[PDB]
């Protein structure tokens, strides 16, 4: 299941890096660097903007995603998933 595991991994990894970047020592590093205020810090601002929306949207679709003769009614579930999603 490449798609399901792909987006689950994306949500987990990006949340983990998102509090690798919002944690305490990183915050002190950003302010100690902000005793210089030259150029780089708007670039990390925009890259944090890259982080947050992808993080939350990955979380949303992870919460959404949660013999075959006997298992055609399961296909109704599939249409209903496409119906519901």
């Amino acid at each position: 299941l490449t798609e399901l595991n792909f987006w689950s991994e994306r949500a987990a990894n990006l949340n983990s890096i998102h509090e690798q970047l919002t944690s305490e020592k990183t915050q002190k590093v950003v302010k100690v660097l902000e005793l210089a205020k030259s150029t780089y810090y708007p670039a990390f601002q925009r890259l944090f903007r890259e982080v947050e929306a992808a993080q939350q949207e990955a979380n949303d679709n992870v919460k959404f995603l949660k013999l075959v003769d006997l298992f055609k009614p399961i296909m109704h579930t599939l249409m209903l998933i496409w119906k519901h999603s």
Partner: peptide
């Protein structure tokens, strides 16, 4: 010579709201 499956899947989608 399957109504209850519909309703329950609606319920589980509403649990994921």
């Amino acid at each position: 010579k399957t109504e209850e499956q519909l309703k329950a899947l609606e319920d589980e989608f509403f649990k994921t709201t």
